[PDB]
Amino acid sequence: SRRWFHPNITGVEAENLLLTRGVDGSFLARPSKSNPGDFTLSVRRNGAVTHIKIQNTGDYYDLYGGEKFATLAELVQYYMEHHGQLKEKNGDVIELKYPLNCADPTSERWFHGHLSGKEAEKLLTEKGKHGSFLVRESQSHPGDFVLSVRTGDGKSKVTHVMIRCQELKYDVGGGERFDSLTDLVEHYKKNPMVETLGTVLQLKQPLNTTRINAAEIESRVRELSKQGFWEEFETLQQQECKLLYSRKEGQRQENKNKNRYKNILPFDHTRVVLHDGDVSDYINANIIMPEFEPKKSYIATQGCLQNTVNDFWRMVFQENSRVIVMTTKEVERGKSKCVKYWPDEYALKEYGVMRVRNVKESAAHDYTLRELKLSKVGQGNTERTVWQYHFRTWPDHGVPSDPGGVLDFLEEVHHKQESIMDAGPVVVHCSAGIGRTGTFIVIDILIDIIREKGVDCDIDVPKTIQMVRSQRSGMVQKEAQYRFIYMAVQHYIETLQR
């Protein structure tokens, strides 16, 4: 439902498109062909198109020479409405007014392309349930399309609705003619077709094409590497307009300086709220609570700023967290991604009301473990041990070339968490708390399913990531992190089968 994203036009085609069926204020987004992994926002201005470059780093999105953002959709939403203002060479505003929509269905979850009617029915027979649907290119073979829906031994059935494609518009056989399959699908999702005898063709969810058996990940990763990692990742990105929840508190003027990046904010419905303060209730952090159709939870947060060290420790104590995961080096590559928030070994420091004492550091190859004792000043007895696992060897660009460093790291983290009864959520941070942080948390979630349920269980990487992204914006930034997640689960899986 991210309709203004054109998954493969050329920037030249994007110009003529904006100049012919757009007006001043029209815009679209497309992936950059010249800068793989980055994006171009094309905008019509004074009857001319300008192209704004957006870099997707492993930590955020970077409007070149401007602000950083968690997702494309949050970036567009910012300028279309909430605050924003995007300015010219001098100081004249470039206004984003009118999304120019794309008709390409190839990235949509429900779209399957070349597919027979008997293979679709088998797919819906097998993995589907009530309301599961898919859209394939026409059997009876014209150049039309077929909507296959599963409704309802004979209690269930698959119904095939044909979709006419006539002079660049789509329909079933009566009613409205739509500019794209996506508009058609969204329309008849909201207004279900009814059969002559009353059967309601509800469209409740596209047929799941991404869930696999965990024991079978080696073959799926093979298929994905030959359908493929990039297409699967783009299909997930195409779902980000469903995740534009409000971030008002982080947007309050009093909280602006508590964000390392002003537009990378915690969702209100999941943010960590600091109690018993002096505002003083705000930290850029979200509970991540995995849910699927007794568990381990996480706090995803940014790296401390100088003025937020004390609230970070307020958070750790309040939430009874006993394990921190730091995914960024102590000295990175010149610019601070996190202010040091822990004492040196055998030292101790007060942080506001909070006292912490570094009891011991164990140096491993890929990480340092710091044993810290946190307590409220004046009230030793509120004291508890917090174990800081500082991951040291994550590369500065890209992901690690082997995930064995991360897996051993997370194994230690998991056993420590398990050793403390009723420990609160594991704290995880990186620079903005979404990219690297998102990668570590998703990996640990999937590995946890396999630890409980064993190797004969169902895992679904895109849906797990979408579930995480509804609790903090832009979790898991790039395709290389996405592949890393599959790779990490694979090597974990071929260690239990051993």
Swiss-Prot record:
Signal peptide: none
Domain Tyrosine-protein phosphatase as annotated: residue spans: 229-488
GO molecular function (one): cell adhesion molecule binding
A GO term from the CC aspect: mitochondrion
Enzymatic class: hydrolase
Annotated phenotype, changing L244R: In NS1; increases MAPK signaling; increased protein tyrosine phosphatase activity
Recorded catalytic activity of this chain's protein: O-phospho-L-tyrosyl-[protein] + H2O = L-tyrosyl-[protein] + phosphate
Substitution effect: N286D: In NS1; common mutation
Tissue and organ distribution: Widely expressed, with highest levels in heart, brain, and skeletal muscle.
Effect noted on mutating Q481E: In NS1 and LPRD1; does not affect subcellular location; decreases protein tyrosine phosphatase activity against CDC73
Consequence of substituting F69L: In NS1; also found in myelodysplastic syndrome
Gene3D superfamilies per UniProt: Protein tyrosine phosphatase superfamily (3.90.190.10), SH2 domain (3.30.505.10)
SUPFAM superfamilies: (Phosphotyrosine protein) phosphatases II (SSF52799), SH2 domain (SSF55550)
Effect in UniProt of substituting R247Q: In NS1; increases MAPK signaling; increased protein tyrosine phosphatase activity
Domain SH2: residue ranges: 4-100, 110-207
Impact noted for substituting T382M: In NS1; uncertain significance
Annotated phenotype, changing T439M: In LPRD1; does not affect subcellular location; decreases protein tyrosine phosphatase activity against CDC73
Reported impact of Q477P: In LPRD1; does not affect subcellular location; decreases protein tyrosine phosphatase activity against CDC73
UniProt keyword Phosphoprotein, yes or no: yes
Illness the protein is tied to: LEOPARD syndrome 1: A disorder characterized by lentigines, electrocardiographic conduction abnormalities, ocular hypertelorism, pulmonic stenosis, abnormalities of genitalia, retardation of growth, and sensorineural deafness.
Function description: Acts downstream of various receptor and cytoplasmic protein tyrosine kinases to participate in the signal transduction from the cell surface to the nucleus. Positively regulates MAPK signal transduction pathway. Dephosphorylates GAB1, ARHGAP35 and EGFR. Dephosphorylates ROCK2 at 'Tyr-722' resulting in stimulation of its RhoA binding activity. Dephosphorylates CDC73. Dephosphorylates SOX9 on tyrosine residues, leading to inactivate SOX9 and promote ossification. Dephosphorylates tyrosine-phosphorylated NEDD9/CAS-L.
Name this polypeptide is given: Tyrosine-protein phosphatase non-receptor type 11
